[PDB]
Design a protein around this ligand. Structure first.
Ligand SMILES: NC(=O)c1ccc[n+]([C@@H]2O[C@H](COP(=O)([O-])OP(=O)(O)OC[C@H]3O[C@@H](n4cnc5c(N)ncnc54)[C@H](O)[C@@H]3O)[C@@H](O)[C@H]2O)c1
Ligand SMILES: NC(=O)c1ccc[n+]([C@@H]2O[C@H](COP(=O)([O-])OP(=O)(O)OC[C@H]3O[C@@H](n4cnc5c(N)ncnc54)[C@H](O)[C@@H]3O)[C@@H](O)[C@H]2O)c1
Ligand SMILES: NC(=O)c1ccc[n+]([C@@H]2O[C@H](COP(=O)([O-])OP(=O)(O)OC[C@H]3O[C@@H](n4cnc5c(N)ncnc54)[C@H](O)[C@@H]3O)[C@@H](O)[C@H]2O)c1
Ligand SMILES: NC(=O)c1ccc[n+]([C@@H]2O[C@H](COP(=O)([O-])OP(=O)(O)OC[C@H]3O[C@@H](n4cnc5c(N)ncnc54)[C@H](O)[C@@H]3O)[C@@H](O)[C@H]2O)c1
Ligand SMILES: Nc1ncnc2c1ncn2[C@@H]1O[C@H](CO)[C@@H](O)[C@H]1O
Ligand SMILES: Nc1ncnc2c1ncn2[C@@H]1O[C@H](CO)[C@@H](O)[C@H]1O
Ligand SMILES: Nc1ncnc2c1ncn2[C@@H]1O[C@H](CO)[C@@H](O)[C@H]1O
Ligand SMILES: Nc1ncnc2c1ncn2[C@@H]1O[C@H](CO)[C@@H](O)[C@H]1O
Lengths: 430, 430, 430, 430
């Protein structure tokens, strides 16, 4: 009857395997969860449904969940985020995958539905990134909410929506805040974007960063990280915000701060890290310098009113996959990347293996807590035990040769914490 | 009988007032508290005794408190931090001041006792910086504990000693952790230091930063700032940490992380941002390069073992106030700045006015809650209302010309916060 | 008989043309040269044969040359650097192109042989980048030295070999040192590599640059630029050099200077900007941590002992074009890139359009001088008029929106230069 | 009769010497010129007259000159650049010094005159910095030119006024362009200001760099360093220039380049590195933000129209030595530093010892060339031999733990250079 998996070219399985083995070598954390729980298989009897850009990095994660005894039905939470060779490998591995690069929004949903029913019945766990899976089931298949033991959210947009469902009595299952995890937000969000964002602008535009004026919307971890990438290349970064604290940070860092109404007149490259709608309007395109490159890193595509463009451009010529050059009714052109969607994961390849492992480590730890200590997590959105947090970083210090110092009893007694024990307070903010 | 105030040279008040007039212009938040709460005098019937480095910046805070209608009796929490003209002006402004640069331990504790009693009776509010004002009373004069309505801690050491006092029911009066306030820890700690450290290093040694090797022990907000400073000058910074996360951060920032035992052989400039004992031992000094520069930026002077030096050095000469060249028994020399005490406030002038206001506005804000919302604060250690937190940054945006954007109804709905209302989640770390 | 051009897929013509259309807008200089001399056609009667990586950027150069009234026959100076869609356009446009990515060494030479004869007889002008075209003819077809009016050198290596043939009496025609031109050397060499080096490593390995140790061999313009790129992502850069001034530089910049013998032990990513043989040897390979990535940004592939790896590696697997993973006899694996040859041009797309236009303008400027004012250039190696030089930077100030300032008579008189007249002395080193 | 020297307070000897002892440790170059030429005493018979900011680092140059057999008479090329303890040491040493911080415009000249005649007769050698000494004699005492064997210029201004005198046949004695020495311009000019400018501002204003708008006029080596300094402190930096190449440079560095006319309205800190007059005019003062900080780093005081303020300001209050707060008619205040003269040497200590040794090694090298190999130096202005240049640097590598690499026969043969020999071509600009 139904399909066992749907990928682009299963003949990409071998090239992706080499890719996977190479990525494994950079994923210290993840490989550590394997050589620690493979025998005890803590996720035995689990049937996980995931919605995460099927990238080479997600395969390493998916095989880490399978090594721990879990069953997995995958999907990518992006039509352009998928990496076909990473998929045509997981499929070959025997894991039913439904994801290719460039699925239509109609395809997108079919792929997610394919991962709701296993052989031993419906799913019992959710691994989400963006919130499509947790909401698609919370509103489209409310009869499965009961057989689902736990939820995991990858990104901020996903965790902001959870907190909403909660405050609106719509959350019927417990979810863990992976994103907000220091070793997650202060690494993947910041450091990750610092290298993947421009990798995306470059591969698609091949533009020279030095000289340009880049406007970044929002100064969050993704903003602080994005802004550091352009500025470090020779660009002049302006920043727009709605948060006093964040706004002061950006200025105290050398960044001019204004509105997009006045900044759209100077910028050559525009980047949205914002979590909400209408960041770059048509009233902004009408003032942008010629060939101005516009992209958005945020999760969903509604930061850039891509509609105004396709409905107000004298013409639109696609240069190549996920790259568009429009001709405005004023002469200027506006190279649009990934049709307004995630730029790093659609024009490039996402965050680097190392950084990606820091987040998946947290994802695997979360899946293990939820599926195993159900009593520890009542319906709501819980953080992950700091202890487990500090654990992710510790698992990666070896691959970087980081040599931690060691307190003595003299100091331990002095400070008051354990020479061997914890001391990382919950107030720290990093 | 008693003394009205004890200061170095009251004839320094004229030059101070000037320096004070220049700083007011740079401390917007402070001024904004004045042009808002002087008439209503919210701190009325208040008798504040505070321990904080009597500098030009602590004078604008002090006079802002009296404007708000308080009774202030000052004192400095460091024998070298004081800024004479700043104390001369305060003394002349008729405020009871006890403090000068270069006091003996025996004088430093006398100065504190002088600010325990007011005409209308003992104190009832505490503004600390290090925990020495809240401890002296808690252990020496416990009987006044009753009269004390609240506590306000300026620095991480005070706040670390607060959660302890609580963990052993030693704390008999509530206190607000001003340090851990976003607009204080991520600005005064990090930025502040990113400017005032080297100033103290330079002003004392006039040493060339570029090309040296700077060893910074501890990668906190202070360690992240001090490192960058040196690093931005052309130095090669090595970092020593005990926490993996913090350590991972440095390693992800390009810094080389190891132990001091191995790094004491390479460094030229030694900076301690750690908050605990024995960072730089003799076991190190014995391996340091000729004329290595060693200083401490952490609050107290037990980071660097100045004792060993004093009792293991061939000869110790004094080039100028707070600068000492030691002649080790191996011929090598070691320039000690401020004798292991705070180098920025010791050899320099401390953080700049603009960053100091963020902390002082928080300071004033705190007292207004403690003294005015006692119910809201039960014995223990509390955080300052995020709302007022975001209020400080706000108060500084104008001076910087930061042009904040404003959400429309459409957006305000989307996201789910108030176009004009709050949306700053407490999960945020910054 | 003979072939009209030989490209990978002329069915890429369409795609390559859009790519060119986007570039032209980014290469202000080349167009300015077009919109200035396409009517006066200064290159009329000339038959240019160039050996420069046939990429999109060079496409714009060629079409500019032809727009100036010249005949052109092209070939790439690298077996992996070619950009087939850009060559398929130059092909359709009617221009004879003998290039494509991945040619055999035996093919690479045949492709150059095709660009030696035109219908009107042999070439009379040479546009080189590496020294292969000027050498092939000097040593293989000496009977053609008479017909060549001039030479144009793109890179250091080429201009280094030019200065030799001369010192040896082998140079039979005059050449122009393009590389040493300020708006090329300090722009292309430095800024081009600061952006394209990394873009080469990523697309090829997708390695996380933050947290790694990057060993850079050579601190020339290409070195200073690679160091800065890697060091801005969080990598730890160690530099190796044979020159004190350059060495004192890296040093004074925060970099650690040592020898590859010591460095090969700490390095994670190795980059050779040096222009001579044996920069990285097997004696090193056998000390490199696991999976170390080794690439070469110099011009020729003799900096890394590739021959050793092949004849000493237990096994070699090719992950994907220009990416090989080697298994040494100690287990460790070495990820070689581009087979030792140019990493940016072979793994990425070379430098971004903007920076290449500076270089490519100098180029067009040279061919005009040599072919038009031969009397000015007597057998040897010369520099491009300091005046023309400054003109390359001035034709770009507009696109960047740079607002130069203008002296007044009072000033112009003061200094002693022309308020409109030149002043940039040749002592200047930038 | 005449005076043996003139200092502010000879009692300052003791401490100066301590500072001189320490500085010697940071000047690996000057000491090397000692342990090498003190016995052979090459400057025997020389009566050197030199105008250079009499500072601790100068006293070291001076003492090196005497150790090499040269007689000496000194004066400061600045009214506020002198360091009284470093002059009270040279005086006690027995050397005739005529300098002291804060000398009226008339004392400045009388000091230079004192150093025009030695017992054995007039001067036969000049070591200048600015061109004061060399001009005063050329125009006031032309009768000494015959007895003067050579000239040494420390800075750009003077060197620019030498090529000038030459171009006007008014230069009657051979001079050496020391400034343009790579290990001088790309170190003293660049890395020197990077630390000296902000130290001057800081000590003077103690203002906060972070979050301010800084305008640097002139993007030369001095502009490159000051720009980078302010920038790494968290300040936004606007750059003004008249040169297209230097201009593109700033822009490809991310700096916004405009004109003071537009800029003056934004900046908070104004720094002049230009070499000419009328940089910051009254027309600019009337638009500046309140309490803006203005200062010049160039050599002489005519970049900032100080005369205008003095004659258009409501009132001018002196904050303290070399610091003034002016009151314009619009209520705004202008904090003027050093009265418009060098800000790094007038309010700070100048460049750190280490860097001042590279410059001073060249200084002592030139005198040994002019005063020992005259036939080699005809009337005009020459560059110090490249061989000697590379020596300066090479002589500082050890102190910084730099570990240069050595070429092999295999490579030297390759390149064509001497494994042990030189190769630093003069086409290199560094
Ligand atoms: N591209 C990736 O690979 C990737 C990685 C991480 C997170 N994300 C996405 O990024 C978003 C979260 O960003 P984060 O975690 O880096 O930081 P965050 O959510 O903390 O950042 C939000 C910041 O943006 C500001 N902002 C909100 N509305 C704005 C408006 N209209 N104009 C200007 N600024 C505005 C807010 O004030 C806030 O300071 C989510 O949508 C998440 O999906 C994507
Ligand atoms: N001089 C100033 O201007 C100034 C400013 C802020 C805070 N302080 C003082 O400094 C401390 C606060 O520093 P902060 O808030 O920037 O940082 P913090 O306390 O958050 O960080 C301390 C860091 O030091 C590390 N550390 C602890 N012991 C160590 C050891 N033995 N070896 C190596 N590393 C070690 C910890 O892992 C931690 O990450 C307090 O003492 C506070 O009083 C002084
Ligand atoms: N990939 C590209 O885009 C690109 C761009 C420009 C130049 N190049 C190539 O680069 C070379 C020119 O370099 P450039 O203009 O960037 O700077 P440059 O030529 O000035 O660099 C030479 C530097 O490398 C150093 N060096 C020489 N031998 C060394 C050795 N054996 N070990 C360590 N260091 C050594 C030299 O001392 C010198 O400082 C030529 O090969 C040229 O063909 C490639
Ligand atoms: N105080 C110090 O420590 C110090 C150190 C070095 C040099 N200096 C002085 O600085 C000058 C030269 O500096 P350098 O060697 O760093 O570089 P340089 O002489 O190359 O700098 C000159 C640059 O300034 C620019 N400029 C000239 N007029 C301008 C104008 N009206 N507006 C804007 N920009 C303009 C020019 O375009 C040029 O690029 C000399 O006067 C020298 O005396 C002072
Ligand atoms: N390489 C990648 N593979 C999988 N997930 C990624 C990757 N790159 C970024 N992400 C995650 O994507 C989320 C948003 O969709 C970010 O929070 C980040 O955590
Ligand atoms: N300029 C200064 N005046 C008063 N307090 C300061 C100053 N500089 C730094 N500090 C404070 O010193 C504390 C540690 O003693 C830091 O928390 C910071 O708040
Ligand atoms: N994008 C590119 N297109 C054409 N030539 C390039 C490109 N990138 C780098 N180069 C040139 O390659 C030369 C060395 O092969 C460098 O001097 C540089 O000028
Ligand atoms: N510390 C210092 N000692 C002596 N001369 C200095 C000092 N700092 C800078 N200078 C010199 O002042 C010159 C310009 O007057 C600069 O070229 C620089 O060489």
């Amino acid at each position: 009857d139904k399909l066992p998996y749907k990928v682009a070219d299963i003949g990409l399985a071998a090239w992706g395997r080499k890719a996977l083995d190479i990525a494994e070598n950079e994923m210290p954390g993840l490989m550590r969860m394997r050589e620690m729980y493979s025998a005890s298989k803590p996720l035995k009897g689990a049937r996980i449904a995931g919605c995460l850009h099927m990238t080479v990095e997600t395969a390493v994660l998916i095989e880490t969940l399978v090594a721990l005894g879990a069953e997995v039905r995958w999907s990518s939470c992006n039509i352009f985020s998928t990496q076909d060779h990473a998929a045509a490998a997981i499929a070959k591995a025997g894991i039913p995958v439904f994801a290719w690069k460039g699925e239509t929004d109609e395809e997108y949903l079919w792929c997610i539905e394919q991962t709701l029913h296993f052989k031993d019945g419906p799913l019992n766990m959710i691994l989400d990134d963006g919130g499509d899976l947790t909401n698609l089931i919370h509103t489209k298949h409310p009869q499965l909410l009961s057989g689902i033991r736990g939820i995991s959210e990858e990104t901020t947009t996903g965790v902001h929506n959870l907190y909403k469902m909660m405050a609106n009595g719509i959350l019927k299952v417990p979810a863990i805040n992976v994103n907000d995890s220091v070793t997650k937000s202060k690494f993947d969000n910041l450091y990750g974007c610092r290298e993947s964002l421009i990798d995306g602008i470059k591969r698609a535009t091949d533009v020279m960063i030095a000289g340009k004026v880049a406007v970044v919307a929002g100064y969050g971890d993704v903003g602080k990280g994005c802004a550091q990438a352009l500025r470090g290349f020779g660009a002049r970064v302006i920043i727009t915000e709605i948060e006093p604290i964040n706004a002061l940070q950006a200025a105290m860092e050398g960044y001019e701060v204004t509105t997009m109404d006045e900044a759209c007149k100077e910028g050559n490259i525009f980047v949205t890290t914002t979590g909400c709608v209408d960041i770059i309007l048509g009233r902004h395109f009408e003032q942008m310098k010629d060939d101005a490159i516009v992209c958005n890193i945020g999760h969903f595509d509604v930061e850039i009113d891509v509609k105004w463009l396709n409905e107000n451009a004298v013409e639109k010529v696609n240069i190549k996959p996920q790259v568009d050059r429009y001709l405005l009714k004023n002469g200027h052109r506006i190279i649009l990347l990934a049709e307004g969607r995630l730029v790093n994961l659609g024009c490039a390849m996402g965050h680097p293996s190392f950084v990606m492992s820091n987040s998946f480590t947290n994802q695997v730890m979360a899946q293990i807590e939820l599926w195993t200590h159900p009593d520890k997590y009542p319906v709501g959105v819980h953080f992950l035990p700091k202890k487990l947090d500090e654990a992710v970083a510790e698992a990666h210090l070896g691959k970087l040769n980081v040599k931690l110092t060691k307190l003595t009893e003299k100091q331990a007694q002095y400070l008051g914490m354990p020479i061997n024990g914890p001391f990382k307070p919950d107030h720290y903010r990093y």
